[PDB]
Structure formats: structure tokens, C-alpha cells
Write a protein that binds this ligand. Structure first.
Ligand code: HEM
Ligand code: HEM
Lengths: 121, 121
């Protein structure tokens, strides 16, 4: 059976999601300060991670090793404020990119869980 | 063409914007300390400025002369953190006050530039 990666149109669709997400992050003074001056490497890492998580190429683990996202987010103070902002933008990206059901629901479910689990304050 | 002021509903809309903005300022320790004990005179001055800038009455100039905003903000140490806090609350105020597009975007564009250019430390 098709992976979600396949269900939603593969790499091109993840590119679109991450583009919308990062545009919103860049424009959000609640969040911009946490990110580097050069956003591009992180934007690439996020695209590759999502592609991998949802059944696509394992390019992410080739570049970056194990995700260990909770450890990677430890340097950023993340409370409900940051969580809510992040989720707002990623769900808007999902919805704006036209991801079809049922995959869109799986992705939302994952993000709601993962955003909560990333909080550290 | 009609002014932004007219497009967004005039004085009444700016009152809503500034009320929401100042409520947020008062509740934000990043900013509150910069403002005087009595916020009301400055609140009215800010409302009149916005009204004038976006094409409404020239009441601001009658009361305060030229805006000279960078000069007037010199007494306040304003860096990236203060910029970010101000912009967060003003952008939220535009959204919560119901400012329609495309006018809202013009106002956002102006604020993003002005907030950056106000920094002095
Ligand atoms: C579902 C929740 C989240 C997921 C799936 C996610 C995913 C990722 C991934 C894959 C990376 C790149 C890791 C790497 O360097 O290989 C990353 C980095 C980052 N994330 Fe998240 N994240 C989430 C939540 C958050 C939240 C809540 C915040 C802050 C509000 C945040 C801010 C950051 C920042 C600042 C970076 C560093 C970016 C860079 O190095 O350029 N993330 N995230
Ligand atoms: C787009 C950026 C900004 C605009 C358009 C703006 C506009 C104004 C205006 C029109 C006034 C009243 C001027 C007068 O006295 O006649 C004012 C005062 C003031 N502004 Fe701003 N401002 C901006 C950025 C900031 C920032 C970044 C801060 C601090 C983070 C700040 C803090 C203050 C304070 C403390 C006052 C004095 C208020 C009072 O005297 O009651 N402003 N601003």
C-alpha cells in the first residue's frame, strides 16, 4: 500500500508545506528569534525529516543521523507560547498545501502530539 | 483612491486597534517599563498618529507637530527584543480589530519597516 509520502505527492508536496511553514515562522516575532540568521539549512533539514518520517527517502538520516528531536530542541526555550505558534503555522501549511484526506489527518495528529512533546518549559 | 484610513473604517477602527495594542503592552513586562505611569496621553497620541499616517485627520500634527518618531523614541533603549515585542502586539491588534485585506498588509508592511528603523541599541 502507498506510503503517506506517496499518498500526498511526495517530495514536491513536502517542499510546499515546509515553504509555507517557514514563511510564517520567519514573519512571526514569537518565533523568529529562536532560528538562525540563515534559515536555509534548517529548512532543508525539516523537509528531509518530514519526507523520511512519512515513508519517503531516508536522506535525513544520511545527513543528520538519528532525529532525536526532543534533545535537538533542548537549547530553545519552548513553552505553550512557542508550541502554539509552531502548530498554528504547520497546520496552516498543511491546509494551504492541499494535502488530501486521510493523510492530512495523520499528519495533523502527529504534529499535535509532537509539538506538545517538544515543550521544555 | 480612498486612503487606507477610509478603507478600514476610519477613526473607530483605529480606536479598536490601539485599545488592543495597549492592553497587550500593559500586560507585557518586556515593554511596560518603558512607558509612563499614566498611559492615556501617549495612547491618544499614538492613535492620532496612526490615523494621520494612513490618511485621516491631521489632528496629530495640530497637537504634536511632525512625528519625528525616531527622535521621540531616543529615550527608550530599543533593541531586537523590544522591536519583536512591539511588532508582535501590533500585528495581533490588526488581526483582532478586523482590519481587511489588502489594507491590513499595507499597515503590516509599514510597521515592520518602522519597528526595525526605531531601534537604537
Ligand atoms: C511537531 C513539533 C516539531 C517538529 C516535528 C520539529 C522538527 C524539527 C526538525 C526536523 C528540525 C531539524 C533538526 C536537525 O537539525 O536535524 C528542527 C529544528 C528546529 N526547530 Fe523544530 N520541530 C518541532 C517543534 C518545534 C517548536 C515547538 C519549536 C519552537 C517553537 C521549534 C523550533 C525549532 C528550531 C529553532 C530549530 C532549529 C532550526 C535550525 O537549526 O535552523 N520546533 N525542528
Ligand atoms: C512601527 C514602530 C513604531 C511606531 C509607528 C510607534 C509610534 C509611536 C507614536 C506615534 C508615539 C507617540 C509619539 C508622541 O509622543 O507624539 C509613540 C510613543 C512611544 N513608543 Fe512607539 N512606535 C513604534 C515602535 C516602538 C517600539 C519598538 C517601542 C518600544 C519597544 C515603542 C515605545 C514607545 C514609548 C515608550 C512611547 C512613549 C509613550 C508615552 O509617552 O506615553 N515604540 N510611539
Amino acid at each position: 500500500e502507498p506510503t503517506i509520502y506517496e499518498q500526498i505527492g511526495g517530495e514536491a508536496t513536502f517542499r510546499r508545506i515546509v515553504d509555507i511553514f517557514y514563511a510564517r515562522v520567519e514573519a512571526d516575532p514569537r518565533l523568529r528569534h529562536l532560528f538562525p540568521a540563515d534559515l536555509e539549512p534548517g529548512k532543508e533539514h525539516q523537509r528531509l525529516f518530514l519526507m523520511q518520517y512519512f515513508g519517503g527517502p531516508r536522506t535525513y538520516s544520511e545527513r543528520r543521523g538519528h532525529p532525536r528531536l526532543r534533545m535537538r530542541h533542548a537549547p530553545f526555550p519552548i513553552g505553550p507560547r512557542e508550541r502554539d505558534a509552531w502548530l498554528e503555522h504547520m497546520l496552516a501549511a498543511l491546509n494551504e498545501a492541499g494535502v488530501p484526506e486521510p493523510a492530512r489527518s495523520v499528519m495533523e495528529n502527529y504534529f499535535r502530539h509532537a509539538a506538545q512533546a517538544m515543550m521544555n518549559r
